[PDB]
Amino acid sequence: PTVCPVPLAHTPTVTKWFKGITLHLTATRPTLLTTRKLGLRADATAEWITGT
Amino acid sequence: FEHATTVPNVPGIPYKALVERAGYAPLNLEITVVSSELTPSTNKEYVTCRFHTVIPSPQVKCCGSLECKASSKADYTCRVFGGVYPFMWGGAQCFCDSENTQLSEAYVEFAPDCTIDHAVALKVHTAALKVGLRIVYGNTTAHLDTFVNGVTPGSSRDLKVIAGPISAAFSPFDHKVVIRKGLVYNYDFPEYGAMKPGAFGDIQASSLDATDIVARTDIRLLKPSVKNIHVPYTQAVSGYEMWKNNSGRPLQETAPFGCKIEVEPLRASNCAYGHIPISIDIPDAAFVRSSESPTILEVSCTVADCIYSADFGGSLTLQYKADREGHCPVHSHSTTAVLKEATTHVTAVGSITLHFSTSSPQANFIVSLCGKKTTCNAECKPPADHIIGEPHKVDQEFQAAVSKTSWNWLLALFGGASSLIVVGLIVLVCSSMLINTRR
Amino acid sequence: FEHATTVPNVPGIPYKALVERAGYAPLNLEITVVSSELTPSTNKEYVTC
């Protein structure tokens, strides 16, 4: 084992709205986005995103 | 003195309470769950990884016969073939064109790189929740790690506390768990000995170095057709790789209640759920009798602009008249409002400005200053923002969650019907009585 | 903190408002239209003399 360098994606732009957010995301290469709620139901979602 | 309360298991959110001993002056008590650790008890059933299908060099009984022995290797497979007459490099290996049998032998072992890239299969049992608590009373703060079961007491050198049980037990881990390079998955792996080829746990062992490896990889040997010596075989793909491709996201990205999964040992830290009943024996030494504490004479509340949000978006002022200079404790006596400051310097006569956060549309709550209670009446507007990076510090109830305008309209609309049916009953009774009297 | 106002478009006359965040003291906001130019979309058709 050792330490490998990995890239950091462009920081997303978050736009708020009543009980909701909109992440404008830019990633030249497939970047993983994983979201989950903090309640009884995780409602976990995972997606590999490309482009903008 | 012993006091009982119910602290909400949400890390980082202080919970404030007032202990009002009759003889003594009231005292503050703020409790924070600095960290929690929901850890189960686990036993390792086996480890699995890529198998190395090792093939021993074939043997030929040159002009005789061979019989398949019974070894105890992992997924051992031995077959015997008839006359082969094999070639290696010199154009011949034997002297009998027939009755020249060959023994094809094959089995599996652990791959050399399995010491890092291997998965461990575990079963979980009832999990015990441990909490680190920072608790402050008056002047004294105390850090203590305790078990939330209602029996095991935590202690800090004068302070005894018992915590729990949790109102509703919960475990993010299913019965069967798999750990791979720190990642945790809830996979219903096959039991030890129930190997199935082409799926997870097709090769199993108690440890990487254990020699009693058992596997079922569906390896089968075929008749050698080519003239040159070689042992053919076909085998199902490694089920470890199949699960690795179709593993899915780990439990670090799927556990609910914001539960941070961790390994070595398996645990779930900073997990926010439920309420912890805590009974605490606060020592009487820290308590200060009312005869020496400044008991304020006359205090009133004037509330500035307020808003119901997670952040401290409310302000108010307490105009007080007291008899001495001291360190009076201020508190809120409602479940839908929490102050920022705990102990405030009180003078002979003056004012103190304080902050508060509420969940109700209307601030209709009693504030207490050195025991003296005053009802603050306000009207908090909806928050301007939509999202915050901070948790809501107070639960939203049903009773104190609707404005007094809505309450007045609803009560008027319902009391109209109630008074109308009452008036109808009264009218019927009066008519009957008038009929009876004038009959 | 986003504050929305309707400033009258009158150069040289300041418009004053008070922003009142709930948990924080009010602040003063003076907006003055120092200059304002309205420029149309233009394209020369021709010249003459």
XYZ file of C-alpha atoms in Angstrom:
540
model
C 0.000 0.000 0.000
C 0.937 3.615 -0.638
C -0.655 7.009 -1.370
C -1.883 7.873 -4.874
C -2.863 11.356 -6.140
C -6.406 11.659 -7.512
C -8.073 14.726 -9.084
C -10.578 17.075 -7.476
C -13.564 17.990 -9.639
C -14.797 21.505 -10.319
C -16.830 22.623 -7.320
C -20.562 22.454 -8.171
C -22.805 25.515 -8.199
C -25.707 25.023 -5.774
C -28.977 26.882 -6.395
C -31.467 26.660 -3.535
C -35.251 26.468 -3.704
C -38.099 25.591 -1.353
C -37.261 22.102 -0.048
C -34.697 21.415 -2.745
C -31.310 22.100 -4.330
C -30.024 22.132 -7.899
C -26.366 21.244 -8.438
C -24.915 22.591 -11.674
C -22.042 20.170 -12.264
C -19.117 20.226 -14.695
C -16.792 17.244 -15.114
C -14.733 16.662 -18.250
C -14.458 12.968 -17.272
C -16.897 10.579 -15.526
C -17.178 11.788 -11.923
C -19.195 9.967 -9.269
C -22.010 11.796 -7.471
C -23.566 10.038 -4.467
C -26.407 11.620 -2.481
C -28.413 10.315 0.465
C -30.995 11.613 2.917
C -30.324 11.712 6.668
C -33.660 10.277 7.831
C -35.375 6.902 8.136
C -35.010 6.248 4.387
C -31.579 6.829 2.865
C -32.994 7.266 -0.663
C -29.414 6.832 -1.839
C -28.688 7.793 -5.448
C -25.428 7.250 -7.340
C -24.520 8.454 -10.821
C -21.441 8.837 -13.013
C -21.686 12.262 -14.670
C -19.864 13.549 -17.760
C -19.887 16.925 -19.456
C -21.851 19.803 -17.949
C -29.056 15.599 43.533
C -30.414 13.236 40.863
C -32.132 14.541 37.722
C -33.738 12.704 34.806
C -34.107 14.024 31.264
C -34.329 12.886 27.611
C -31.458 14.152 25.439
C -31.938 13.992 21.643
C -29.251 11.800 20.041
C -28.107 14.328 17.434
C -24.323 14.924 17.634
C -23.172 18.504 18.055
C -26.556 19.983 19.066
C -26.553 21.088 22.735
C -29.606 20.346 24.861
C -30.301 22.767 27.714
C -32.253 22.111 30.910
C -32.830 23.747 34.293
C -32.685 21.854 37.592
C -34.877 23.645 40.146
C -34.052 22.381 43.619
C -36.608 23.791 46.049
C -34.137 24.818 48.748
C -31.411 25.986 46.367
C -31.364 28.338 43.380
C -32.017 26.900 39.895
C -28.969 25.600 38.032
C -28.232 25.137 34.332
C -27.345 21.867 32.612
C -26.173 21.679 28.987
C -25.478 18.296 27.379
C -23.841 17.619 24.002
C -23.271 14.258 22.306
C -19.726 14.866 21.083
C -19.486 11.466 19.386
C -21.379 8.171 19.210
C -20.291 4.654 18.257
C -22.864 1.999 17.324
C -20.650 -1.105 17.197
C -21.948 -4.693 16.686
C -20.384 -8.029 17.666
C -19.121 -9.939 14.628
C -17.553 -13.314 13.852
C -15.551 -14.036 10.697
C -17.090 -16.927 8.774
C -14.537 -16.922 5.954
C -12.458 -14.928 3.483
C -12.698 -15.053 -0.301
C -10.841 -13.630 -3.293
C -9.644 -14.582 -6.769
C -8.662 -18.240 -6.957
C -5.476 -19.362 -8.692
C -6.413 -22.530 -10.586
C -3.167 -24.453 -10.185
C -2.632 -27.426 -12.490
C 0.014 -29.991 -11.429
C 2.264 -31.291 -14.177
C 0.497 -34.310 -15.746
C 1.842 -37.829 -15.246
C 1.641 -40.688 -17.752
C 1.870 -44.379 -16.970
C 3.721 -45.161 -20.136
C 2.466 -48.697 -20.897
C 0.244 -49.451 -17.905
C -2.715 -47.863 -16.126
C -3.468 -45.161 -13.556
C -6.244 -44.646 -11.014
C -7.554 -41.343 -9.679
C -6.595 -40.947 -6.019
C -8.611 -38.982 -3.418
C -6.752 -35.873 -2.257
C -8.169 -33.098 -0.060
C -7.226 -29.966 -2.006
C -9.714 -27.179 -2.750
C -12.074 -28.288 -5.537
C -9.725 -31.157 -6.347
C -10.428 -32.740 -9.729
C -8.584 -35.740 -11.179
C -9.381 -37.758 -14.307
C -7.696 -40.585 -16.217
C -7.519 -40.740 -20.023
C -6.544 -43.639 -22.265
C -3.759 -43.805 -24.840
C -2.452 -40.328 -25.707
C 1.130 -40.832 -26.978
C 2.310 -37.309 -26.082
C 5.115 -35.187 -27.538
C 7.301 -32.790 -25.519
C 10.275 -31.812 -27.711
C 11.911 -35.029 -28.987
C 9.072 -36.378 -31.118
C 8.026 -39.018 -28.573
C 7.504 -39.540 -24.844
C 6.452 -43.207 -24.767
C 6.866 -46.594 -26.442
C 3.259 -47.901 -26.537
C 0.914 -46.312 -29.078
C -2.008 -47.690 -27.020
C -2.542 -48.337 -23.287
C -0.583 -45.120 -22.694
C -2.847 -43.472 -20.142
C -2.539 -39.936 -18.771
C -3.632 -38.472 -15.426
C -5.119 -34.972 -15.603
C -4.992 -33.201 -12.236
C -6.219 -29.759 -11.203
C -7.212 -27.768 -8.129
C -7.407 -24.193 -6.833
C -5.569 -22.111 -4.236
C -5.534 -18.481 -3.118
C -3.974 -16.039 -5.557
C -0.637 -14.500 -4.480
C -2.119 -10.975 -4.378
C -5.058 -12.056 -2.188
C -3.399 -10.784 1.006
C -4.659 -7.286 0.092
C -7.534 -7.837 -2.370
C -9.780 -10.135 -0.350
C -13.263 -9.881 1.145
C -14.193 -10.979 4.671
C -17.678 -12.365 5.366
C -19.219 -11.563 8.765
C -22.483 -11.985 10.641
C -23.689 -9.265 13.014
C -25.653 -9.446 16.262
C -27.331 -6.936 18.585
C -25.319 -3.704 18.541
C -24.468 -1.635 21.622
C -24.480 2.157 21.251
C -21.694 4.052 23.047
C -21.730 7.851 23.371
C -19.171 10.436 24.394
C -20.846 13.292 26.250
C -19.685 16.802 27.102
C -21.864 17.992 29.986
C -21.567 21.380 31.702
C -23.264 22.446 34.932
C -22.654 25.894 36.378
C -18.879 26.282 36.253
C -17.802 22.657 35.751
C -17.492 20.868 32.406
C -17.029 17.114 32.081
C -16.161 14.736 29.239
C -17.289 11.138 29.701
C -17.694 8.050 27.518
C -20.639 5.835 28.469
C -22.699 2.918 27.176
C -26.340 3.598 26.305
C -28.115 0.647 27.925
C -29.627 2.004 31.167
C -27.301 -0.044 33.411
C -23.640 0.754 32.757
C -22.737 4.067 34.476
C -20.316 6.660 33.178
C -18.205 8.540 35.703
C -16.054 11.682 35.813
C -14.381 11.781 39.236
C -17.382 13.234 41.083
C -20.156 12.958 38.478
C -22.146 9.745 37.949
C -24.501 9.305 34.982
C -26.620 6.482 33.561
C -27.922 6.726 29.998
C -30.509 5.020 27.845
C -32.008 2.815 26.644
C -32.399 4.257 23.129
C -36.060 4.902 22.354
C -35.933 2.849 19.131
C -33.037 0.495 18.432
C -31.614 0.649 14.915
C -28.683 -0.918 13.061
C -27.591 0.061 9.512
C -25.979 -3.377 9.124
C -28.082 -6.280 7.890
C -27.530 -9.749 9.342
C -24.774 -10.652 6.846
C -21.981 -8.207 5.967
C -18.976 -8.214 3.626
C -15.854 -6.083 4.145
C -13.528 -5.420 1.192
C -10.533 -3.081 1.576
C -12.430 -1.090 4.199
C -15.637 -0.786 2.177
C -18.711 -2.327 3.817
C -21.583 -3.982 1.941
C -24.735 -5.733 3.158
C -24.578 -8.846 0.978
C -26.310 -12.143 1.787
C -23.240 -14.256 1.137
C -23.600 -18.058 1.007
C -22.923 -19.944 4.215
C -19.601 -21.658 4.859
C -19.530 -24.928 2.929
C -22.403 -23.945 0.607
C -20.141 -22.964 -2.273
C -21.834 -22.254 -5.612
C -19.662 -21.696 -8.716
C -19.691 -18.395 -10.556
C -20.962 -16.429 -7.537
C -19.557 -14.802 -4.414
C -17.809 -17.077 -1.935
C -17.100 -19.890 -4.389
C -13.735 -20.305 -2.612
C -13.779 -20.086 1.189
C -11.259 -20.413 4.005
C -10.995 -19.552 7.683
C -7.935 -17.393 6.946
C -5.550 -16.484 4.147
C -2.918 -18.854 5.575
C -5.379 -21.651 6.407
C -4.610 -24.865 4.521
C -8.171 -26.279 4.730
C -9.443 -24.393 1.694
C -12.806 -25.543 0.308
C -14.115 -24.424 -3.074
C -16.597 -25.373 -5.805
C -15.593 -23.690 -9.080
C -17.142 -26.228 -11.504
C -13.710 -27.129 -12.904
C -13.847 -30.008 -15.393
C -11.099 -31.746 -17.370
C -11.415 -32.651 -21.053
C -9.775 -35.303 -23.201
C -6.453 -34.067 -24.675
C -6.893 -33.907 -28.454
C -3.687 -32.196 -29.603
C -0.606 -34.346 -30.152
C 1.604 -32.201 -27.914
C 1.402 -32.701 -24.160
C -1.042 -30.338 -22.475
C -3.900 -30.665 -19.990
C -7.116 -28.876 -21.069
C -9.786 -27.659 -18.681
C -12.750 -25.292 -18.553
C -13.853 -23.571 -15.363
C -16.527 -21.099 -14.315
C -15.420 -17.492 -13.953
C -14.336 -16.241 -10.543
C -17.441 -15.291 -8.593
C -15.370 -12.815 -6.590
C -14.841 -10.734 -9.732
C -18.525 -11.115 -10.620
C -19.539 -9.654 -7.258
C -16.834 -6.984 -7.556
C -18.298 -5.793 -10.859
C -21.863 -5.971 -9.464
C -21.002 -5.005 -5.878
C -23.013 -1.781 -5.895
C -22.331 1.213 -3.736
C -20.923 0.513 -0.238
C -22.696 1.176 3.061
C -20.683 4.372 3.573
C -22.935 5.950 0.898
C -26.237 4.218 1.787
C -26.577 4.029 5.588
C -29.532 6.170 6.783
C -29.696 8.701 9.637
C -26.371 10.194 8.536
C -24.474 7.209 9.931
C -20.715 7.231 9.231
C -19.657 3.613 8.726
C -16.150 2.593 9.799
C -14.091 -0.588 10.114
C -11.419 -2.116 12.363
C -13.592 -2.785 14.325
C -16.865 -2.545 12.379
C -18.812 0.409 13.758
C -21.117 3.292 12.862
C -20.007 6.662 14.246
C -21.886 9.969 14.552
C -25.263 8.306 14.064
C -28.234 10.607 14.710
C -31.443 8.857 15.753
C -33.711 8.505 18.760
C -33.677 9.921 22.279
C -31.445 8.907 25.208
C -33.043 9.015 28.686
C -30.282 10.132 31.063
C -30.408 10.028 34.870
C -27.516 12.009 36.337
C -26.343 12.508 39.934
C -25.098 16.102 39.837
C -23.136 16.764 43.067
C -24.566 19.173 45.620
C -21.216 20.974 45.951
C -21.689 22.921 42.710
C -25.190 23.971 43.792
C -25.520 27.439 45.346
C -28.362 28.277 47.720
C -30.809 31.045 46.851
C -29.947 33.018 50.000
C -26.616 33.970 48.371
C -27.545 33.966 44.675
C -29.157 37.223 43.440
C -32.924 36.708 43.278
C -34.177 39.313 40.815
C -37.170 41.405 41.865
C -39.066 42.396 38.693
C -38.224 41.344 35.127
C -40.063 41.890 31.840
C -39.523 40.664 28.277
C -39.523 42.756 25.081
C -38.943 40.737 21.909
C -37.321 42.115 18.753
C -37.663 40.729 15.223
C -37.659 36.924 15.275
C -37.639 34.136 12.696
C -38.042 30.356 12.970
C -35.008 28.660 11.423
C -32.146 26.370 12.387
C -29.807 29.324 12.961
C -30.239 31.751 15.871
C -32.485 34.159 14.005
C -34.303 35.598 17.003
C -33.455 38.293 19.527
C -35.078 39.608 22.692
C -34.372 41.817 25.702
C -35.001 41.217 29.402
C -35.404 44.396 31.463
C -34.649 43.362 35.043
C -34.568 44.852 38.535
C -32.565 42.809 41.057
C -30.743 43.262 44.377
C -27.126 42.158 43.797
C -24.413 41.686 41.174
C -24.073 38.046 40.137
C -24.121 35.341 37.448
C -27.799 34.487 37.078
C -28.697 31.506 34.827
C -31.199 32.251 32.041
C -33.269 29.536 30.386
C -36.251 28.941 28.095
C -39.154 26.897 29.497
C -40.536 25.757 26.122
C -39.814 22.805 23.848
C -39.934 24.980 20.686
C -37.319 27.600 21.611
C -33.668 27.523 22.699
C -31.390 30.352 23.836
C -27.708 30.909 23.029
C -26.328 32.223 26.326
C -26.639 30.162 29.512
C -25.278 32.277 32.399
C -25.638 36.068 32.246
C -24.114 38.691 34.515
C -26.983 40.311 36.428
C -26.662 43.805 37.915
C -28.803 45.731 40.388
C -31.040 47.221 37.671
C -30.692 47.090 33.905
C -31.212 45.103 30.713
C -29.760 42.065 28.957
C -30.028 41.249 25.243
C -30.241 37.557 24.330
C -30.575 35.427 21.199
C -32.834 32.458 20.537
C -33.902 30.009 17.839
C -37.484 28.781 17.519
C -39.455 26.318 15.408
C -42.911 27.851 15.997
C -44.338 30.648 13.793
C -45.149 32.540 17.020
C -42.848 32.994 20.012
C -45.305 32.201 22.826
C -42.829 30.926 25.373
C -41.809 31.455 28.994
C -38.271 32.678 29.704
C -36.861 32.111 33.190
C -34.224 34.278 34.872
C -33.008 33.114 38.305
C -36.388 31.421 38.715
C -38.568 34.377 37.740
C -40.768 33.443 34.770
C -42.082 35.815 32.086
C -44.074 34.938 28.968
C -42.501 36.345 25.801
C -45.099 36.968 23.076
C -43.876 37.511 19.513
C -44.706 36.769 15.871
C -41.882 35.177 13.875
C -41.872 35.457 10.086
C -40.941 32.670 7.661
C -37.206 32.330 7.008
C -35.723 34.123 4.017
C -33.266 31.366 3.060
C -34.201 27.942 1.658
C -31.247 25.758 2.712
C -28.722 25.872 5.564
C -25.510 24.015 6.321
C -26.568 23.617 9.966
C -29.050 21.201 11.582
C -32.381 22.268 13.028
C -31.626 22.520 16.745
C -35.272 22.112 17.868
C -37.953 19.611 16.872
C -41.118 20.880 15.169
C -44.226 19.893 17.139
C -47.937 20.117 16.241
C -49.367 22.277 19.041
C -46.842 25.140 18.856
C -46.382 25.039 15.086
C -49.343 27.115 13.788
C -49.708 30.875 14.111
C -52.221 32.480 16.456
C -53.986 33.951 13.421
C -54.558 30.464 12.008
C -55.446 29.226 15.496
C -57.983 32.028 15.946
C -59.576 31.429 12.541
C -59.798 27.659 13.081
C -61.180 28.050 16.601
C -63.747 30.600 15.415
C -64.870 28.332 12.572
C -65.220 25.309 14.884
C -66.708 27.160 17.852
C -69.351 28.556 15.536
C -70.638 25.047 14.864
C -70.239 24.042 18.519
C -72.165 27.065 19.801
C -74.775 26.551 17.088
C -75.479 22.940 18.088
C -75.516 24.038 21.741
C -78.025 26.786 20.913
C -80.140 24.291 18.983
C -80.224 21.919 21.947
C -81.105 24.826 24.251
C -83.886 25.916 21.880
C -85.315 22.391 21.764
C -85.230 22.093 25.563
C -86.842 25.518 25.991
C -89.585 24.702 23.479
C -90.333 21.408 25.232
C -90.439 23.119 28.634
C -92.729 25.855 27.292
C -95.041 23.209 25.824
C -95.140 21.372 29.154
C -95.738 24.539 31.193
C -98.456 25.979 28.924
C -100.008 22.541 28.307
C -28.426 37.992 2.390
C -30.469 39.032 -0.653
C -32.427 42.293 -0.360
C -34.773 43.398 -3.152
C -35.655 47.080 -3.607
C -37.233 49.270 -6.297
C -34.891 52.245 -6.638
C -36.444 55.197 -8.517
C -34.408 55.989 -11.631
C -33.606 59.601 -10.751
C -29.904 60.611 -10.916
C -28.519 62.506 -7.946
C -31.293 61.613 -5.466
C -30.166 58.880 -3.017
C -32.621 56.127 -2.093
C -32.269 54.868 1.481
C -33.440 51.585 2.980
C -32.943 49.486 6.111
C -32.052 45.799 5.814
C -33.248 43.854 8.867
C -31.890 40.343 9.250
C -33.760 38.580 12.025
C -30.951 37.706 14.438
C -28.751 40.693 13.566
C -28.917 44.447 13.986
C -30.411 46.434 11.075
C -28.050 47.976 8.535
C -28.450 51.059 6.349
C -28.326 50.857 2.545
C -27.992 54.009 0.421
C -28.227 53.492 -3.354
C -27.526 56.455 -5.646
C -27.719 56.424 -9.445
C -24.592 58.464 -10.163
C -24.870 58.028 -13.937
C -27.164 56.217 -16.363
C -26.856 55.992 -20.155
C -29.441 54.492 -22.519
C -27.797 53.478 -25.806
C -29.821 52.025 -28.731
C -28.882 49.397 -31.303
C -27.568 51.413 -34.246
C -26.460 50.649 -37.797
C -25.443 53.199 -40.420
C -27.630 52.953 -43.510
C -25.729 55.670 -45.397
C -24.248 59.170 -45.271
C -25.054 62.282 -47.288
C -23.785 65.810 -47.903
